[PDB]
Ligand binder design. Structure first.
Ligand code: PRO
Ligand SMILES: [Mg+2]
Length: 364
């Protein structure tokens, strides 16, 4: 007998450059928590339903997890764009959702069954601007690019634009693209002609990494910040050597000395031979929130004997009240399911072996 927890992530499509890191973290969490006894003796069972990269796929995954797989709660989806489209299904069904990577403004406000462990763009993104200015104090002109078809990218770019203007910098252009684009020559050229010292990109990984390449190939030599959509080790194979030096803010540090983080990190390194990335840590944390909340319920009433609709509502109520020492540090929730997290970091991509392998190097 097991407790089914739904995992709805982008396992396929270009969005899987991000989603597969989340799958990896979720799988590590399942083994970790079950090795520790699951929920007071009752194992959890993660049930994966691929969302692909679109709204339709996410709607399908949520419907299946709720109705066919009868899950007690969902971790997912990968994109805020997908969350806005599919989370109302869970809200209507009164099934909790914990977003592992949905950082757009407005996610917690979708409803009282929606929470997130992923800190919002407003608190995360400005850290990389601050880091860029520390590395080059004489940056004056900034060019910004964003994916206008994506809810997160639109939300993130607003943060970046306001942040740079508030720092007294000159925003010379805001260039639009689509996450599905492959050619960025015209936007890159138009930005380059305006002589920026810093370029900031809000998109996803396949698109973002190719935009980085095309900027460099057109002769742009200045600093580059990538937003959270580029924040995956799978971007290294996209921009290759041209990824080198890109600054990306982080909501996770592999070096945090919490016991659970140390165990998570060890398991990740053992399996993948690299340090755990943010999205893996955040996915682990989402599973942890469910496991520890189920344990809290279980001490009062055995979870394996609670009927599903009741269990779902009680689980949602419980998780919002919990405090958790996760890979992300100590976290808790506001009454609408926003994460409470104050520690953030910045990393810089360091490439090696003629662009064939890379790592996120954390700035001190
Ligand atoms: O909210 C989103 O869509 C992006 C995906 C990775 C981090 N946040
Ligand atoms: Mg909420």
């Amino acid at each position: 007998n097991t407790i089914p927890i739904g995992i709805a992530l982008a396992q396929t499509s270009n969005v899987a450059l991000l989603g597969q890191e989340q799958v990896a973290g979720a799988k590590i969490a399942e083994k970790y928590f079950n090795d520790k006894g699951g929920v007071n003796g009752t194992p959890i069972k993660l049930i994966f339903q691929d969302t692909a990269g679109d709204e339709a796929g996410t709607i399908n995954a949520f419907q299946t997890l709720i109705n066919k797989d009868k899950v007690v709660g969902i971790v997912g989806p990968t994109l805020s764009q997908q969350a806005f489209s599919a989370n109302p299904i869970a809200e209507r069904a009164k099934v909790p959702v914990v977003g592992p990577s949905n950082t757009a403004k407005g996610i917690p406000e979708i409803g009282d069954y929606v929470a997130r462990v992923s800190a919002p763009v407003s608190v995360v993104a400005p850290n990389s601007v601050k880091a860029a200015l520390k590395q080059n104090p004489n940056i004056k002109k900034v060019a910004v690019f964003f994916a206008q078809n994506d809810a997160f990218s639109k939300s993130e770019t607003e943060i970046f634009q306001q942040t740079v203007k508030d720092q007294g910098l000159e925003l010379v252009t805001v260039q639009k693209f689509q996450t599905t684009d492959t050619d960025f020559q015209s936007q890159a050229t138009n930005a380059i002609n305006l002589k920026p010292d810093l370029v900031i990109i809000s998109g996803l990984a396949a698109d973002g990494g190719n935009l980085v390449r095309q900027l460099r190939e057109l002769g742009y030599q200045g600093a580059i910040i990538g937003g959270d959509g580029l924040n995956t080790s799978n971007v290294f194979a996209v921009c290759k050597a041209l990824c080198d030096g890109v600054l990306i803010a982080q909501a996770y540090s592999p070096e945090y000395t919490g016991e659970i983080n140390k165990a998570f990190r060890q398991a990740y390194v053992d399996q993948y031979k690299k340090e755990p990335p943010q999205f893996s840590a955040q996915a682990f944390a989402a599973v942890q929130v469910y496991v520890e909340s189920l344990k809290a319920l279980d001490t009062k009433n055995k979870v394996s004997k609670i009927q599903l609709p009741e269990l779902r509502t009680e689980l949602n109520k419980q998780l919002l009240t919990g405090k958790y020492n996760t890979p992300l540090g100590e976290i808790s929730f506001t009454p609408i399911g926003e994460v409470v997290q104050k520690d953030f970091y910045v990393a810089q991509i360091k490439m090696e072996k003629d662009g064939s392998q890379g790592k996120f190097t954390f700035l001190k």
